[PDB]
Amino acid sequence: FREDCPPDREELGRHSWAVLHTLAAYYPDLPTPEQQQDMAQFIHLFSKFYPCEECAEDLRKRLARNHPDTRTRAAFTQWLCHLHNEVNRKLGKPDFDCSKVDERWRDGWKDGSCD
Amino acid sequence: FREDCPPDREELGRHSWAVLHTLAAYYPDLPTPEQQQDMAQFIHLFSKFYPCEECAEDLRKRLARNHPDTRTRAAFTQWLCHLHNEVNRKLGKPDFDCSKVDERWRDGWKDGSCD
Ligand SMILES: Cc1cc2nc3c(=O)[nH]c(=O)nc-3n(C[C@H](O)[C@H](O)[C@H](O)COP(=O)(O)OP(=O)(O)OC[C@H]3O[C@@H](n4cnc5c(N)ncnc54)[C@H](O)[C@@H]3O)c2cc1C
Numbered sequence: 001f002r003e004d005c006p007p008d009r010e011e012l013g014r015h016s017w018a019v020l021h022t023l024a025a026y027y028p029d030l031p032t033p034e035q036q037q038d039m040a041q042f043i044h045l046f047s048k049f050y051p052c053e054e055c056a057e058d059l060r061k062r063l064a065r066n067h068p069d070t071r072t073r074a075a076f077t078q079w080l081c082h083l084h085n086e087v088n089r090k091l092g093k094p095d096f097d098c099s100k101v102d103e104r105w106r107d108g109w110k111d112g113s114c115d
Numbered sequence: 116f117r118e119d120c121p122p123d124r125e126e127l128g129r130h131s132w133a134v135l136h137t138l139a140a141y142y143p144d145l146p147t148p149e150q151q152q153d154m155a156q157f158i159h160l161f162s163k164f165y166p167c168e169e170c171a172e173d174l175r176k177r178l179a180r181n182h183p184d185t186r187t188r189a190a191f192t193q194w195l196c197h198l199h200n201e202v203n204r205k206l207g208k209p210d211f212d213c214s215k216v217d218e219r220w221r222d223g224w225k226d227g228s229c230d
């Protein structure tokens with residue numbers, strides 16, 4: 001019941017996926033070379049400091065198997081959605097439909113259910 | 116009432132301070148030179164992509180005025196608490212007592228109110 005407590009692994013995960021998907025949703029459609037480098041490196045550095053060891057190793061192996069595609073906002077928001085679905089699958093959670101990621105993390109649902 | 120909606124600036128901020136303070140709380144007490152460099156750069160890259168423009172410019176000016184101290188976990192968790200209090204003050208919110216940051220973001224309150 002006490003809200004201002006350290007978050008657990010699941011709470012830290014929800015915070016972290018919200019931060020990552022939100023950063024992705026606003027990344028440029030046409031990023032410069034340096035922004036593309038900087039986002040890849042951000043993701044790398046995120047995985048280095050993520051404080052759940054099991055999460056982070058798993059994750060660093062995932063990233064080795066599937067490198068951040070930061071060429072454009074489309075590629076990068078989708079890449080990150082595919083990444084997050086691998087973690088969902090690993091954990092027995094259903095796939096998120098990646099075609100909804102702009103709705104979910106930038107624009108809101110088209111039916112107006114977020115307004 | 117619909118929970119799976121894009122977060123607003125305040126919601127994105129709570130997610131983001133939770134992610135940052137949590138990363139800090141678990142940073143090493145004796146980080147290697149490369150970890151020290153990597154955390155400074157992480158913070159820099161975070162400020163580059165943070166998607167609230169007003170938040171980010173403000174923030175990039177703050178960081179120019181007061182560089183991330185990543186020499187140790189003590190210095191870095193405190194630095195980040197001081198940073199977050201400047202944003203609190205800017206916004207008319209009261210100071211967070213930085214002496215509580217291990218309790219709040221790693222260990223839980225000493226009275227056991229998080230157990
Ligand atoms: C980088 C990272 C690695 C992690 N590794 C582990 C691990 O190894 N083991 C472990 O137990 N936990 C791990 N976690 C935590 C875990 O993924 C969940 O965050 C936590 O279990 C809470 O799950 P949840 O059901 O609340 O939804 P979350 O997975 O946290 O998702 C939050 C919301 O995002 C939306 N969403 C779901 N999937 C996608 C998607 N593919 N794309 C866009 N939006 C989506 C949905 O609205 C969902 O409610 C990791 C978290 C992160 C950020």
Ligand SMILES: Cc1cc2nc3c(=O)[nH]c(=O)nc-3n(C[C@H](O)[C@H](O)[C@H](O)COP(=O)(O)OP(=O)(O)OC[C@H]3O[C@@H](n4cnc5c(N)ncnc54)[C@H](O)[C@@H]3O)c2cc1C
Nearest residue numbers: 004125128129131132169170173174196197199200202211
């Ligand atoms: C980097 C960054 C820059 C931002 N810039 C702006 C801006 O320019 N303008 C704007 O309107 N909003 C900005 N925000 C959002 C803003 O700071 C708040 O997150 C948002 O207004 C919600 O505030 P809150 O009252 O819910 O608590 P938050 O400030 O989000 O804090 C969440 C919790 O952290 C704990 N806490 C509070 N202070 C500290 C501290 N100093 N150290 C450790 N723990 C603490 C408390 O438990 C608090 O409830 C920024 C957010 C971030 C992450």
